[PDB]
Amino acid sequence: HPDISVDVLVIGAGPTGLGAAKRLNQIDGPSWMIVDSNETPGGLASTDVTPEGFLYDVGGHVIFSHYKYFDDCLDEALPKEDDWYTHQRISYVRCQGQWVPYPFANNISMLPKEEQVKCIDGMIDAALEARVANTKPKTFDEWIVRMMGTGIADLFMRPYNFKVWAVPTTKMQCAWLGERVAAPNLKAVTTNVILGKTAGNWGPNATFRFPARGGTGGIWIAVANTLPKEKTRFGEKGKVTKVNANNKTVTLQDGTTIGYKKLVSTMAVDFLAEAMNDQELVGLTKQLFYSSTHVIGVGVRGSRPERIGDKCWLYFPEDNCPFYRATIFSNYSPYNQPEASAALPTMQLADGSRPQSTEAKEGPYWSIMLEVSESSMKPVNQETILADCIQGLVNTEMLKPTDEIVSTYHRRFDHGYPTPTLEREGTLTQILPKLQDKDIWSRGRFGSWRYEVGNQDHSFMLGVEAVDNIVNGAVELTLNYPDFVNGRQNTERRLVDGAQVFAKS
Amino acid sequence: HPDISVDVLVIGAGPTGLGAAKRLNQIDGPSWMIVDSNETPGGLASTDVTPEGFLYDVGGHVIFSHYKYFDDCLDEALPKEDDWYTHQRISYVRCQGQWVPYPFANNISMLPKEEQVKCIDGMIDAALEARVANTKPKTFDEWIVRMMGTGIADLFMRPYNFKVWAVPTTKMQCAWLGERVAAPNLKAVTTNVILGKTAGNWGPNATFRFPARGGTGGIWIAVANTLPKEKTRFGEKGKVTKVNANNKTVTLQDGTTIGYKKLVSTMAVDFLAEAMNDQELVGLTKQLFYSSTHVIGVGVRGSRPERIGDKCWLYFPEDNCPFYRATIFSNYSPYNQPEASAALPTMQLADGSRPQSTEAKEGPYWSIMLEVSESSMKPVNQETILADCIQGLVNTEMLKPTDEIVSTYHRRFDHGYPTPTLEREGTLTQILPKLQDKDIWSRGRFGSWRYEVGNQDHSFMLGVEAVDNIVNGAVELTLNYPDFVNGRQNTERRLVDGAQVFAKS
Amino acid sequence: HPDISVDVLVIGAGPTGLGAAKRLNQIDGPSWMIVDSNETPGGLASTDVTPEGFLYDVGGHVIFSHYKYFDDCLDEALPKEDDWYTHQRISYVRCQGQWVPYPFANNISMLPKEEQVKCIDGMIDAALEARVANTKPKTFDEWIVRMMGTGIADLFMRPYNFKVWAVPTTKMQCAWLGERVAAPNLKAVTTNVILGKTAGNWGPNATFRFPARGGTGGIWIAVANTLPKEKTRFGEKGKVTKVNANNKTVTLQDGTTIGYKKLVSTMAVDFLAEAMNDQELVGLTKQLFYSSTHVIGVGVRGSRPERIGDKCWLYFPEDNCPFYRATIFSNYSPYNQPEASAALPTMQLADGSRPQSTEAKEGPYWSIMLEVSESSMKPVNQETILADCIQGLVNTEMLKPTDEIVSTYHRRFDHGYPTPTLEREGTLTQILPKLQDKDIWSRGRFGSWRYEVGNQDHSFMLGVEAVDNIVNGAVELTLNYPDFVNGRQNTERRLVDGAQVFAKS
Amino acid sequence: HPDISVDVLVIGAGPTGLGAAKRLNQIDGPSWMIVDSNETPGGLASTDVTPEGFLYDVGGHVIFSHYKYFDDCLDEALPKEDDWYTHQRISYVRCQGQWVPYPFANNISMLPKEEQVKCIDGMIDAALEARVANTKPKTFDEWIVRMMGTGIADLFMRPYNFKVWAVPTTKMQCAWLGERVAAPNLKAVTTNVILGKTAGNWGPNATFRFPARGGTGGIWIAVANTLPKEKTRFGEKGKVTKVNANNKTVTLQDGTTIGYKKLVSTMAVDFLAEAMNDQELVGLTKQLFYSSTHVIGVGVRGSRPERIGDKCWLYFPEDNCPFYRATIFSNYSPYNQPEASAALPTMQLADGSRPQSTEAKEGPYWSIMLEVSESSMKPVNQETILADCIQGLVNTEMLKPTDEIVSTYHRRFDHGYPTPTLEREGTLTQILPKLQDKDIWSRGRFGSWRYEVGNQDHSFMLGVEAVDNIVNGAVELTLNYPDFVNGRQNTERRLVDGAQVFAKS
């Protein structure tokens, strides 16, 4: 007999596992338990802080919720209006010395005219081909060239996506992008070119809310806090080391055994296979591809520069910086960095030189968060990546040579992106049913490895829906039909359903 | 203070209401109750029997299930292997003196060569048009022509569908036929023409199962019998006459009042509007279109004729008979008609003449079940329809003039088919949200009026999913996404879910 | 026995008949004669002069030669370099206050942006349709919209061609336009819009030459002067009044009868039918359509205005002037108007007011030649057309209200344009073969009535080729294959052929 | 000074040269003469006879005339009705044991149903592709597949045309096939398949006439006979050995020199280049490609077999015989072979055995003429090709094993077909204008190397039009515009033109 026995055991207290926990807690039927090797819940949706007081998420984390259930749990966790800041979804593409509003294609009127001609000629070809197309694109690259034409593809989506995915666009599928036809919006693009118009896809109704304190990680700490503490096991005491799928027994690092009837596992599925000592699953999960993410944080002295303004996140297709995305993390909340009265010495100037003075000086401070991808196909010199990022900031005119850097952060996350390679689905439909047949629901960004449902809300709901499938025979919609959940407002499932209402009466 | 109070009240014990009841009974959380104006459950899936012992469904009722849940409940209701007979899905189109195997298009080698040429030429036109098509068809009629071409459209699907829907194909939408592209399989069609090949779309795996006894109606009687009787109220005592949406009160014919928190209504939504005395909903619901169904049954003396053979249901595009569909109901179960030793007098010959002898003679017997549609655009003379059907049987060579008719059946069903008119969705999306706002789940073939999810399994699941939405926050997938539920085997929801397993333990 | 007998009789000494004459003269085989009712050869390629000394062709006459033979004869007629002036083919479309360089489509960057959007959008539509097109346009109008898209068509070619042809574009055929596919050069148009480029289709390559003296009419006088005088009969003495096709006799005004073996007739073919007293032909030729041409000439005092500059001819689609084309005729030759030292009183100012002084003042002078079309679908008020034209000049900002007019000219030419109606070919293919069966080669702008081979060089060559057909069995390429002769350099036929080289030896 | 001086010298007296000579003779202006290395005129349109009295053309020669002028000269040469036999243009394709009426595609109902399916499927693909095609086919092979689809291409035109051209279809251009769009008549082909219909493209109005005597060669003997003998020089005395283009002097084998002003050379242009000792031209003409033609003739004892019947020529795609075409030459004239009373011993049986006796037996006789192509890409074993051909005749069931062969014939013609390779036009534009600039009109099947204008009428008219260009400035339409002359009836040029009519007065 194992030390602990529960009906449903949840491994991992990132958004997915917490989703499973929250749903189990709401249903209040089967016994359950959640474990995490980290004392602090949140996983990749956690937040670090430098010794100088600058917070950094694991790269740009902007919430767009497809589900009311997710909203319910965030509202429960952080119920006060001052728990959040609301911002417009402002993003630009750095291109040829300019900040081009996203979407790129609608804003190429900013480029030299001769280049616009190349862009529009390419999109005309694509439109004419789209007109007689009777096949779907088979690769991410084909998809891009059909949508954008060669010229526009080459300027942004092709080089940008290699910098993101750390694999060539030709090596990825495109089903993950959705069911919409791969055909250019020629009229809209040439209209903006003709009008000399620029326009971002944001405004008063295109917004996101961000936690006032604790970064994105503050949400998941707060969400976790609503769970009965005794049913949680976070820290070294909750690190899973072995999974015995045949005995339905999990062994933790401290030797604790937990027997389960159903397992919801949210650790990366390649790690799950290893913990299972299942050589066949190890082989299969090794066929999956993923990139690592280097997060670089730079804390800068000064009031926010006008050139930066209300920018939130920023895309970098070009070669003059190693990062694919930058986030103005100080715009997300005033508590993402020290108050102006905080005294901090300058560590370096953005041009890499030593500061004139060693002396601690006051703020205000602002803050840049950078992401750099790495894979077997795109190595990263870890030793120079911080300095390369900082030079990248200078090259892109995000920082002046003289800007004073008062804090730096760098951390590598080995499992950063699950790659939608051409081979992903062929592999996953071998892995996930095999685990399913052992009553293991492997779910989450790396639990089930599908980037198109890999955000915080998707993840959360993958855990929720796994539990719902386990308990109430629900369809795992997020898992198996990304286009479905992403194409609608999911309003049916609530933190308080009829069940809880009828039971209280 | 009403006579009865329940959490969830179900109006109607056709498949939809029984689905609601079955799921409610399984969940065994919220209190619930089901009423029906008929002492016998089954609604349009019920079965009549003539004084001579010939059973008739409400027209051809053949089950194809999209749900394991539905399968679970039928297996529970009728668990013996001899509770069912299995048949291949054998259907034919009557056309120019011939029984043409379905699908029609794949079998036009049976038509005159000159006609084949016209058919193939039309389909060539359609194939070439489809190659450069960039719009969806907007009407049922466009859909048909784009799929078949003019020649083939005119032979079968155009005139057939008028005889079914009692409206022109040009007045119906085509979204209900699903997401499949309106394109011809020119190759398949020409290939069978060239080979002089015929091929039906059935075989050892294209089957259905039919109840051994009591016709289709026997399923729903058996299913209802699994419910706690004290929670059922069937007969004049169960007839709803008033629904007060604002007080959440239902009044029955005998004066009994029922209080509900949530209402699952499976009566025709235009009747619900009337029962609610809601003038706005009344106005909106009579904007919905429907046809009535005349079911005509003909019991015939003799062993099954060779010309009939294993035929199950039959399509009649031509105007030499009033019915659109015929079912060889005696093929579905030997118990749909009297045993061979039973003595019955001959009522008339198929050509309308009197029999030579009035004496009762033995069988064996076979049975034809016919459907005639009626609408404001297609009146039916109730006084002559039986005679006209029987003449139609002779005209189509199903009966010889000499065949001995020993039983007739005719019944008009007011609400037969909810019509997928162009205006249906515009109307429904005004009606269902208003009912929803009042905590009324109006669901079913006429509860929610969508033919494409109008079969017994859909209906059953509409009830089930409505309950699941009310209780567990489930998406009503059958209701809102016909294409989704019809394009998969829905396997997640079972008659025994995890919740009941964990509860028993 | 007729007064004169010749092998080949040529009626008419416009370019066509002179073509026939020149070729007959060169061949110097069969006997021949040429007659004209006019003492001055040239037909519609003649030139008038006003009492003030301003020359006007019959509307804008610009030579583009497709034939070496035509060049040979022109070189023989006017051999000196100073017999000619060379100019670039400079033309503009007057549109919304702007002189838009021809071709119109390539210069819409001069229009308001919002209009460029509509134009480009329409041409995108046309481009996308053209990609899947599998039929030829049936009408001029369809041809235009397929080439240009709606927006661009509506701006220039649609309203312009109605003002030219005096019939709707929907009533004309489009074969006459040539074999080029009716498809938009979207890329060229969008490219120039993006670049803000304006470009006319002219330069040092694209030139025409114009006679130094006597206007276009000076050419044909000089060509006619190369003919043996005694074989010509020009004036009232040469006016044909009757053709007896059955007797092969022509009767002149003065009573002179001419017998011929073959007749090359270049008068309008409807007049020919009348002269033949052939009622069948009269019937047929009355079914042909043609517009009349009003030529309005305006002599203006002053050096050439800067706004006019090197402009040659000008198109006017818009409704603020009655003319469809204007020619800066003073740009074609300094001898088209009096020298600067010539003194002329001011007749009126352009706004219609009287001049302050009635005295003769010196120049220099420039000159505008306008064309207004007339037909039964488009009446012209002869009494007001001059004044309306002059108002048009002000409206289009060709003339300032203050500009001094020193000469006016108006003349109506009954047969101006042979109209490429939908019906034209059906009618002509009935007329010409009947004339052919009587050894009558009816040829020329109204001899054979085909605009697409209706210029001076085509006309000349129609006569040349008729004679070559008559004598040498040559194919009448210009007559029957406009596309052929217009799509190539016709260099084989020379004014000195091998036959004359070998003969002289 | 040369021995002879003429205005125009014509080299070669096949149809091309004779054409030039006829037109020169008719014009009767410039002095001229015509030479040939052969005593008998006719070139590749000549006829041989075996010692046993069997005539053979140089392979199948069937006249289809596009020109009245050619008709006039043939009528002049052979004016009597009994100088000619008229036959319907009856041809078949040998395929899978069947004689399939030409055109093949319209007659594939003769093939097995499974072949029909493959054919129609392939043509459906071609039809769908042609619906969106917007490029011309670049090669002969692309043209075939686009017209026919794969199945049909593979059965006839692909393998047949390799057997003809002795180069792969992928190595040839397709412009020579004319300007008709490369698209299938799917409807017509499937219609005949559906109906089980066969139909040859012949009838009472699809005929050819063949000379009663002397085979095709009889025509050109007769045409040449109409020329003044003293202007001809045929035989060793007329063999050109040297052409000095700079001196305009030609040297014959016997030392005779002929000065000319214009040269019409109809010898193969590569031969001309050698005769000119012009290394540049030799190099260019060596880039041209041509195939050699082996003509095999077989004389057979017996009345014409029923299986043969009225067949005229026959196509052989299949690899069970070396020849690409057979001609039932005995059907063309009864004087192509000996009369029935002629006694001839049997030389061999068709199975290859040498017969019993040397007894000369009587007829009647029939006759087969075969063509086998050869090139550097397709060698022919000259020593065995006769025997291989005869075996082919047995394999294709043209001869029974026991059929008695009484005459054999085999001759290799070095220049047989001028190949429309991809490179042909590029090379000819470097050759023919260079010759032109030296006043050399190189014309004819190998004079100008264009197969699409390479028949007897084309060749004749290339000569005629060359003279007409030389003397009268005519367009060389057949040379430069094969589509033009082949798409019309050329009626204008006659053996008696107006010039001669007028002159005789």
Swiss-Prot record, chains A, B, C, D:
The keyword Isomerase applies. Changing residue 89 to A: Lowers the catalytic efficiency by a factor of 125. This is UDP-galactopyranose mutase. Changing residue 180 to K: Lowers the catalytic efficiency. It is an enzyme of class 5 (isomerase). It comes from the Eukaryota. Binds 1 FAD per subunit. UDP-galactopyranose mutase, key flavoenzyme of galactofuranose metabolism that catalyzes the 6-to-5 ring contraction of UDP-galactopyranose to UDP-galactofuranose, the donor used by various galacto-furanosyltransferases. Controls the biosynthesis of galactomannan and galactofuranose containing glycoconjugates. The flavin functions as nucleophile, forming a flavin-sugar adduct that facilitates galactose-ring opening and contraction. SUPFAM superfamilies: Nucleotide-binding domain (SSF51971). Homotetramer. One of its GO terms (molecular function) is nucleotide binding. PANTHER family: AMINE OXIDASE DOMAIN-CONTAINING PROTEIN, PHYTOENE DESATURASE. UDP-alpha-D-galactose binds at residues 59-60, 102, 105, 157, 160-161, 165, 180, 205, 315, 325, 417, 451, 455. NADH binds at residues 66, 89, 91, 417, 445, 455. FAD binds at residues 16, 36, 44, 59, 61, 240, 325, 445, 454-456, 459. The UDP-galactopyranose mutase appears to be an appealing adjunct therapeutic target in combination with other drugs against A.fumigatus. Galactofuranose is absent in humans yet is an essential component of bacterial and fungal cell walls and a cell surface virulence factor in protozoan parasites. Thus, inhibition of galactofuranose biosynthesis is a valid strategy for developing new antimicrobials. Disruption phenotype: Exhibits a marked growth defect, reduced cell wall thickness, and leads to the absence of short beta-1,5-linked galactofuranose in the galactomannan and glycoproteins of this mutant. Strongly diminishes conidiationa and increases susceptibility to drugs such as voriconazole and nikkomycin Z. Displays attenuated virulence in a murine model of invasive aspergillosis. Changing residue 325 to K: Lowers the catalytic efficiency. Its cofactor is FAD. Its EC number is 5.4.99.9. Contains a flexible loop (loop III) above the si-face of the isoalloxazine ring that changes position depending on the redox state of the flavin cofactor. Residues Arg-180 and Arg-325 play important roles in stabilizing the position of the diphosphates of the nucleotide sugar and help to facilitate the positioning of the galactose moiety for catalysis.
